[PDB]
Symmetry: D4
Subunit: 150 residues, 8 copies
């Protein structure tokens, strides 16, 4: 892609509901060229899709957690655990990291009970889990993963 | 909102580019009622917007980090630091948490150098920062923050 | 319950040996209405009972400890351990928490020996216990769990 | 005190609303001797008072925390901090301990917001506070501080 | 024992090679009373013996270590480990403590090799040992365990 | 010194109250040669003195602690702190070590109060002290610093 | 060896491609004596060999790591693990240390993927490995192991 | 560079004292082409120089340390500290890393005293140093930084 695609993406990452006109007029190129470039970006998998950004509060997702998981070493344990963690309802982020913890898990729940029943109890029963340490998020100062071009 | 809104959102959180027909036909309600409900959800701020989901790899965002920041206690330090962290280019997530660290920062960069220059050096110069500990993400097993209804 | 019940409870949490007169006269309501409301609160389980507040020193409970317990992950280990900990003589508090430790145990003993024999040795033999870390309380600056309305 | 006082206290620590008859009949001594012994125990400060045991849930005290506080060393910092911590609304327990933390603070709040505003923000502004680490209690397996004789 | 015994012990803890005369003359009591009191203290096990204080340097005991040992929980593991640690040549101190470590071991060796072969390798093979962490002493600012009366 | 001195010291480190005869007869050398060698060892400072081994329990030294101290870096802080620690009554051991702590302090007191007043409060007021962490010794499995030849 | 050998080595550790003349003329000794001394040093194993110092960047060795490994205690585990770690491609340094970690491993790789596949995955499958913690080197301020005489 | 340069370097990294003949004959290319390629590699800075590999033991470098340094945050502290650390005699490695420590320092000394005087005391006086933690190397299982092509 070129500098022009970047300008297009920088817009779509913020607002995907702009008309081709508004975007074409802003970036200064013909609407048909824009439409082509956008379809192009999707074909090449640069743009994997379009989503509605839903306010978590609106769904009463008040119990936000960031859990560090240490896996029992050996075998294929790490790959297996990673996947078992990604399948848990409420978990939207699973990262394998370098440090004192193996995985960092991002999850959201409506309440403490939901969290205990849907996430904690489950994880504590997963075989390859050595230990977990959950940090409760008391305030989201920022959460805009959609902004990839800064 | 009602059970019907939930079904609508569960779709839009995955694919916001469905036609009113496809959605109306799936949920079994008239297209005009759907259109109204969607506009309604936006007005009430349930749906805050629509974004293009851009593949980070496509932008060579290879250096992914999860940094824990400890703030120097006192004054208005915490609120100030939180905000200074959210303004750093590449940082898309800033969380105030309960535990041994004050903030958890999610950031992405193309390379180690970009990371050092844009993020690390900056943060180490921020007054209210007592200490930082960065965990490098070697593998993203899952990152779908858009899925709020599970 | 209403604001009036709150005023009643705020008194009973401090001194349950006040006469109906003294309380009725303070809150400005008829003694029979008070008596009814109190019986009401007990029926609904708001007031679970009345206890004598006994000075621990008077019983030579000089060895006060706050022990963090880490459980071995898996199975039904956590629920089982929690219960085995609550049954140990001298233990009055058992909490399951989010952090690097699973349970926080509050206990009191007359001496170091009593502590070793009644608590430590027992806990170290409990199967589901991975590790324990005891913090000895050298000074109780405050311990008024009875004050729930502040 | 003697073995008889112990039997009396063991009862009062559980239920202070027993009639002199019921207690006198159980322990097998004359009601007047019992009444005297009880008044005696109060005079000597063994029994410091009687409280109503109020269910915290009934007051929506859902946010339970156990916070470790590290004080900045020097001066009279420790004594001062201990006291400033004991005065915070919602805090019912403050302990000075031997270990990696100076104080362990037990507090209860209705919600996360109340906790942030009444406790966290306050503590982070206290001068003699070096650091704090809060463990959120997700389950109270046991909390019977009233039971001193086991 | 009385204040007089204390004065006697305070002397013997520093220098056990004083004549009865010198001590008797200092404390102002008859030599025969002193001799009796000393024999008395030994009989009652107050004075368990007399030792020559040997300079460790003179024996080339240059490798001084303070090792923290964590035991595997369960069974009779703790008592067993404690004893196995006390039997290792070079180890003069073994303490069971409250904290994140179970035992603190004081040992001395002529060199790193002696330490590795006599202590480290041995301990790492002891079954009930979960982990060890050795802190090398680079400077003895003070080591006068003989001074019990200060 | 030679192998013979070693045999002599190995005896004196255990029992310094043996007669020259008993020792001379055991090691198989003339009493006058022994007496000379012993005086020799003292002159050369191999034997720095003779002490009475006093049972700490006999003096009610029940509160045994092992405290790790972290010093504030810079200046001549370390040397100064080391010395201030060695002067505290009850402290018999002070070690500068390699690890996460700067000094390891061995102390003994009759009670918790004595410990708080004589040691803790003092140390917390020492300027060059950054932090302290005290591990309470609940059991002395072994404490024979006098045994240097094993 | 003597002071002269030291001067020779101090040169060879920096530049082994100096002519015998240049070195002989600098240190002020006959070329034949120098040649002899150098051959001598090699025979005695003081000089174990000569290497070309290759710039790691030139080989795209961009992923530099320092990994701490904790071994499972018991048996011959430590010796075995040490050796298994030294055989891993990319690993140039393996150290057994005193502290909270057993081994410190120095390794270099071209990328994160190479690191994951060649080092991490391998190590996590090694039986005697209890845990690993990798610190990513973002900047080499200095790496001159060749300088032994300073 | 090409595959041929790699083969050349793979040899020179192990033994730089091979004749052009031996190398030319092994890799199967003309001696003049080899000589050219080698000079080429040096010009381009691939080969930065040739060193004698000196056995550290031969120089009595028995005290090997790996020290983690935490810097005081702010200003230009990190860059300054890094450089001050690299200038200390005996220090051959200084790395800025991601984790709980800022720098990892590799150093070697003949004895504990040399280490204390040349390294420790110096570092503890460096202003920008917050804390240091030294791990003593008791065994070098492997140290071949010269092997860059594996
Ligand atoms: N320029 C526009 O925005 C639309 C018309 C233009 N000719 C096109 O490419 O479609
Ligand atoms: N998950 C972890 O904490 C392990 C990562 C760590 N960097 C390692 O050596 O593997
Ligand atoms: N049913 C549909 O999907 C569209 C027609 C319908 N009458 C409406 O509400 O618009
Ligand atoms: N940011 C932190 O780690 C602080 C949170 C911690 N729970 C506290 O007591 O404040
Ligand atoms: N007012 C009182 O305190 C007692 C009398 C009142 N009429 C009642 O309700 O019993
Ligand atoms: N008991 C614990 O420390 C575990 C709680 C931790 N928050 C977790 O992830 O489970
Ligand atoms: N025995 C009782 O319980 C009451 C009567 C008894 N004579 C008394 O001491 O009052
Ligand atoms: N509050 C603390 O953690 C300090 C207690 C610790 N035992 C000390 O040495 O002071
Ligand atoms: N006073 C002394 O020191 C020795 C003589 C004294 N009459 C005694 O008790 O032996
Ligand atoms: N040895 C230890 O560290 C354990 C002691 C710790 N105080 C406990 O709870 O057992
Ligand atoms: N042999 C002994 O024990 C004493 C007598 C011997 N002739 C001496 O050297 O004194
Ligand atoms: N006292 C300490 O813990 C410091 C020792 C540590 N080995 C260092 O680097 O200084
Ligand atoms: N002096 C030199 O550098 C070479 C000549 C000298 N006579 C030798 O020993 O070879
Ligand atoms: N590898 C380690 O961390 C162990 C070393 C530690 N000094 C010990 O006691 O063994
Ligand atoms: N082939 C060799 O090794 C040397 C001779 C060859 N003709 C050259 O290039 O010098
Ligand atoms: N030196 C350190 O430990 C800091 C590195 C850490 N990864 C950070 O956030 O800066
Ligand atoms: Mg999106
Ligand atoms: Mg009560
Ligand atoms: Mg002695
Ligand atoms: Mg070399």
């Amino acid at each position: 892609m070129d500098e022009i695609d970047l300008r297009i993406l920088k817009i779509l990452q913020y607002n995907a509901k702009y008309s081709l006109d508004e975007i074409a007029r802003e970036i200064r190129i013909p609407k048909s060229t824009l439409s082509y470039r956008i379809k192009k970006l999707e074909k090449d998998g640069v743009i994997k899709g379009y989503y509605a950004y839903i306010n978590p509060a609106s769904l009463n997702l008040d119990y936000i957690v960031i859990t560090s998981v240490k896996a029992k070493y050996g075998k294929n344990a790490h790959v297996e655990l990673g996947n078992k963690l990604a399948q848990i309802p409420g978990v939207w982020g699973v990262y394998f990291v370098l440090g004192d913890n193996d995985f960092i898990v991002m999850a959201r729940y409506k309440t403490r009970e939901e969290f205990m029943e849907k996430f904690l109890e489950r994880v504590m029963s997963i075989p390859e889990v050595e230990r977990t340490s959950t940090q409760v998020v008391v305030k989201i100062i920022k959460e805009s993963p959609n902004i990839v071009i800064f």
